[PDB]
A paper describes a structure:
The RSV fusion (F) protein is a major target of neutralizing antibodies, including extremely potent antibodies that recognize prefusion-specific epitopes. RSV F initially folds into a metastable prefusion conformation, with fusion peptides buried within the central cavity of the trimer. Antigenic site Ø is located at the membrane-distal apex of the trimer and includes the α4-helix and the loop connecting α4 to α5 (α4–α5 loop) of F1, and the F2 loop between β2 and α1. AM22 and RSD5 are two human antibodies that bind to antigenic site Ø and are specific for the prefusion conformation of RSV F. Although both antibodies potently neutralize RSV, similar to D25, their binding kinetics and subtype specificity have distinct differences.
To further investigate the conformational variability of site Ø and to identify the epitope on prefusion RSV F recognized by RSD5-GL, we determined the crystal structure of prefusion RSV F in complex with the RSD5-GL Fab to 3.5 Å resolution. The crystal structure shows that three RSD5-GL Fabs bind to the membrane-distal apex of the prefusion RSV F trimer. RSD5-GL binds slightly lower on the trimer than AM22, bridging antigenic site Ø and the recently defined site V. The interactions of RSD5-GL with prefusion RSV F are more diverse than that of AM22, with the CDR H2 and CDR H3 as well as all three CDRs of the light chain making contacts with the F protein. In addition, the contacts on prefusion RSV F span multiple regions including the F2 loop as well as α3 and α4 of F1, burying a total surface area of 855 Å2. The light chain contributes to the interface through contacts with α4, including hydrogen bonds with Asp200 and main-chain atoms of Pro205 and Gln210. Similar to AM22, the prefusion specificity of RSD5-GL can be explained by the dramatic rearrangement of α3 and α4 to form the single elongated α5-helix upon conversion to the postfusion conformation, which dismantles the RSD5-GL epitope. The structure of DS-Cav1 bound to RSD5-GL reveals an intermediate site Ø conformation, with the α4-helix only slightly kinked out and away from α5, but not to the same degree as seen in the AM22 complex. In contrast, RSD5-GL Fab has substantial subtype specificity with a >2,000-fold stronger affinity for subtype B compared to subtype A, with a KD of <0.016 nM and 34 nM, respectively.
Numbering used by the authors:
A (entry chain F): 27 to 101, 137 to 513
B (entry chain H): 1 to 52, 52A, 53 to 82, 82A, 82B, 82C, 83 to 100, 100A, ...
C (entry chain L): 1 to 9, 11 to 27, 27A, 27B, 27C, 28 to 95, 95A, 96 to 210
The structure:
């Protein structure tokens, strides 16, 4: 179920009914590839199959040399957000891997199995996964065939098989080389769908968390980092940093806002108001997580994946701005201007239309064509029976998501202000800031008659 | 000095586990590969196992895979060889040898050879306790005696451990005497036979007694060798 | 692991040259250069003589040379000396990612004439049968060099069960001697026509025979 409410009084709309999936922490996994130490091949074999193997081996050797170079380097209201270090956790685990004998532990731990839990020297337990064993393959399948005294290859399949196995190593290095050892999203070369699902299943997390991550692997990939760490002692290791979702299934809602202007015929005599607090809101541990950059959240059906690094923690009273922008308990954030330009905001279940001046604003159906022409002011139409909206030369398609919309009638609040004392130059203000500014303009007028 | 010194040459019963130790000194241990090579008594050499420079990639012999496990500790410059479910065929002198090819290489073909060898520790598996011997007279055949040079001796059978001494006529006869090497039978007990070359014309005139002395079991038995009709 | 075919005995005289065979398959010898030779003196550990087909380390002389043709590697010792009388083995990479050794070759420098072996068979003594046991003793003595092969036969069919053979050891007159034991039961000893000991030394064959009667 999804619903949406449009508030005519404040030219805004809230879509409710969504469930949260907030990233709260990080899990760090060490992914290793075992490499083979390959010395010179003293044959000048002109056999066509030996030549292709030797060419593939040069690509293999250049990849290792390339990664060794990489491992020598250390890997409206948005402006209110803090500044994190997105891979501080992953890089911290990587630093430990550079200590003496730490790589040897992972390597010997993964000698019998390809998946193990290793305790690092500092005490943290990390899942370690070997995704490709080239050391075993090269030492057990291709070294004898190349080094043969005869110096020729029996069949075509060995050349092809090596190219298949080596390809993954070549692609991983390619990505790291153009991302300075840190990639996001995590591609299928770094971690296949099978390996990731298996890693999630072996993680020390609840069963609910495992299910959520397994059914939304594409979002997990986009919120994960792969950090190139060490390549030493025949081991290539990179750290994959997976999101931990510590908040699940709490109510979330999306606030959409659009400019609300007076509609006088005199061109520049109009004043405008826009709620600046648009973005995502989720209930979280007794407060509300507010994500001003709504483009940092991904909506899948009715589940919203957000990252708390891009959030503020606000008192739950922030919700009062939707039903009463003048409430005394929370200072609702707004901006002011005199730029009464036309535009539309496409919501979850409809469209807000701010239509001013001489702009042509209409809504059309695919079958019947234009079914509503908007007048001056801020208005709203539901997506039921409506397919497109036009504001000036801009055509907007509306979302065809199923769900009920409610039109909450109300007097546009822009009509309550006197333009002679209306502060219309505020880019980052609020209800209370506009109030105190009006009184500072009214006191300069009041204390003049006080002399008379 | 480049030397390899293995130790721990004790006895162990079949079915029990044993762990071999090999020390190293005088060279960069964490740069070479290590081999294990055993040699059965009298028989030839037999390759056992190899561990790379860091103990990551080992290689075992087909007659050994599954039973033995070889490991390495670079922090101690020591090589090990674990042995489980020991059988009688494991009686051999296990040598500790280095690989031929310094480098951080992991393939057995890059260091298949051996250049520096240890001294070797005798590893003996046997479930037999200390038992006294049994002397049987190896008499000459009266028909095959008339030829000039005769042949007779004694037979020390089923004794443990080693060694056993054998003299003739309390040490009076040393001409043409040869005591053979001992052989370990399937039961785990050793068997030995010593013989002498005797002039054929004095087979009825002379007394021939072997003095078999088994000092470990405190057994000294003399058996008289005489012809038969 | 399948062993490598080496000749058991090789004879030579000081000043001569001789060659030792080392036959394998296309996987072990006849496929890779990785073939080495080792000299082992009795008592002391083996010593590397030839690494790879022909390369030799520092210390060994110009008299040791290696070669390979087909599936057979050859070790050549030019100008023999008394210091060369020792056992020689050959190793090889096996293509199956292991290492395999050879059968072994006992090279003897001739400081004596060719001595024909004298053998003697011993039936179970009248006292040994009273212990529910039986042991046929075949003793080879006064032969040269120290390399003989023993074979047992019941009637006309060979026997390989319960047989033990000692390594040829030197006597008090610088001649080699070997033993052979055939552990049997009193029933197995009486229920046969004839037991024979077939000894082979330097091609020739000497065979004695015993019977319960
Ligand atoms: C949708 O239904 C659930 C289950 O009753 C309810 O908790 C939620 O509040 C509903 N959505 C809205 C927007 O009320
Ligand atoms: C204007 O109003 C605010 C709050 O209503 C008050 O604090 C302020 O003193 C007023 N201005 C003057 C000049 O008194």
């Amino acid at each position: 179920n999804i619903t949406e409410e449009f508030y005519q009084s404040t030219c805004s709309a809230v879509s409710k009914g969504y469930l949260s999936a907030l990233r709260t922490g990080w899990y760090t996994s060490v992914i290793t590839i075992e490499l083979s130490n390959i010395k010179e091949n003293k044959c000048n074999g002109t056999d066509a199959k030996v030549k292709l193997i030797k060419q593939e081996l040069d690509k293999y050797k250049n990849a290792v040399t390339e990664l060794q170079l990489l491992m020598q380097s250390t890997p409206f209201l948005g402006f209110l957000l803090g500044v994190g270090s997105a891979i501080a956790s992953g890089v911290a685990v990587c630093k430990v891997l550079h200590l003496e004998g730490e790589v040897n532990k992972i390597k010997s731990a993964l000698l019998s199995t390809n998946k193990a839990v290793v305790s690092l020297s500092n005490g943290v337990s990390v899942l370690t996964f070997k995704v490709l064993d080239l050391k075993n393959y090269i030492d057990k399948q291709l070294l004898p065939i190349l080094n043969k005294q005869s110096c020729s290859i029996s069949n075509i399949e060995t050349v092809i098989e090596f190219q298949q196995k080596n390809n993954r190593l070549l692609e991983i290095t390619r990505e790291f080389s153009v991302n300075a050892g840190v990639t996001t999203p995590v591609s299928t070369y770094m971690l296949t769908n099978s390996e990731l699902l298996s890693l999630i299943n072996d993680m020390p997390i609840t069963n609910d968390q495992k299910k959520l991550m397994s059914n939304n692997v594409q979002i997990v990939r986009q919120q994960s980092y792969s950090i190139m760490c060490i390549i030493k002692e025949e081991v290539l290791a990179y750290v994959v940093q997976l999101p931990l979702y510590g908040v699940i299934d709490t109510p979330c809602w999306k606030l959409h806002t659009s400019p609300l202007c007076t509609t006088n015929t005199k061109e520049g005599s109009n004043i405008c108001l826009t709620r600046t607090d648009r973005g995502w809101y989720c209930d979280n541990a007794g407060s509300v997580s507010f994500f001003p950059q709504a483009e940092t959240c991904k909506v899948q059906s009715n589940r919203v994946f957000c990252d708390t690094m891009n959030s503020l923690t606000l008192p739950s009273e922030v919700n009062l701005c939707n039903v009463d922008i003048f409430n005394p308990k929370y200072d609702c954030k707004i901006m002011t201007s005199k730029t009464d330009v036309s535009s539309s905001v496409i919501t979850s279940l409809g469209a807000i239309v701010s239509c001013y001046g001489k702009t042509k604003c209409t809504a059309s159906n695919k079958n019947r064509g234009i079914i509503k022409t908007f007048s001056n002011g801020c208005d709203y139409v539901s997506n039921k029976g409506v397919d497109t909206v036009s504001v000036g030369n801009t055509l907007y398609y509306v979302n065809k998501q199923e769900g009920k919309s409610l039109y909450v009638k109300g007097e546009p609040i822009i009509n309550f202000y006197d333009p002679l004392v209306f502060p219309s130059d505020e880019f980052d203000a609020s209800i209370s800031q506009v109030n105190e500014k009006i009184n500072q303009s009214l006191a300069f007028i009041r204390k003049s008659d006080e002399l008379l | 000095q480049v030397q390899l010194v293995e130790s721990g040459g004790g006895v162990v019963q079949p079915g029990r586990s044993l762990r071999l130790s090999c020390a190293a000194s005088g060279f960069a241990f964490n740069n070479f590969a290590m081999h294990w090579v055993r040699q059965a008594p009298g028989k030839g050499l037999e390759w056992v196992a190899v561990v790379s420079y860091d103990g990551t990639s080992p290689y075992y012999a087909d007659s050994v895979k599954g039973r033995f496990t070889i490991s390495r500790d670079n922090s101690k410059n020591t090589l090990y060889l674990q042995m489980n479910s020991l059988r009688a065929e494991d009686t051999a002198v296990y040598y500790c040898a280095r690989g031929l090819g310094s480098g951080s290489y992991s393939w057995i073909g890059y260091f298949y050879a051996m250049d520096v060898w240890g001294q070797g520790t005798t590893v003996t598996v046997s479930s037999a306790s200390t038992k006294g011997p049994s002397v049987f007279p190896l008499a000459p055949s009266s028909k095959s005696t008339s030829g000039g040079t005769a042949a007779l001796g004694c037979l020390v059978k089923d004794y443990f451990p080693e060694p056993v001494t054998v003299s003739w006529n309390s040490g009076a006869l040393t001409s043409g005497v040869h005591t053979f090497p001992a052989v370990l039978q399937s039961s785990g007990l050793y068997s030995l036979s010593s013989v002498v070359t005797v002039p054929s014309s004095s087979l009825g005139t002379q007394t021939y007694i072997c003095n078999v002395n088994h000092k470990p079991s405190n057994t000294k038995v003399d058996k008289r060798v005489e012809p038969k009709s | 692991q399948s062993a490598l075919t080496q000749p058991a005995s090789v004879s030579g005289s000081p000043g001569q040259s001789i060659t030792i065979s080392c036959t394998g398959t296309s996987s072990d010898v006849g496929g890779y250069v990785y073939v080495s030779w080792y000299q082992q003196h009795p008592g002391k550990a083996p010593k590397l003589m030839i690494y790879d087909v022909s390369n030799r380390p520092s210390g060994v002389s110009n008299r040791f040379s290696g070669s390979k043709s087909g599936n057979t590697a050859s070790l050549t010792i030019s100008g023999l000396q008394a210091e060369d009388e020792a056992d020689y083995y050959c190793i090889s990479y096996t293509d199956r990612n292991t290492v395999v050794f050879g059968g072994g070759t006992k090279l003897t420098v001739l400081g004596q004439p060719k001595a024909a072996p004298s053998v003697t068979l011993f039936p179970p003594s009248s006292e040994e049968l009273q212990a529910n046991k039986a042991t046929l003793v075949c003793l080879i003595s006064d032969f040269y060099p120290g390399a003989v092969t023993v074979a047992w036969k019941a009637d006309s069919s060979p026997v390989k069960a319960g047989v033990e053979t000692t390594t040829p050891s030197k006597q008090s007159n610088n001649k080699y001697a070997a033993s052979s034991y055939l552990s049997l039961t009193p029933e197995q000893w009486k229920s046969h026509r004839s037991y024979s000991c077939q000894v082979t030394h330097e091609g020739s064959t000497v065979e004695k025979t015993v019977a319960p009667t």
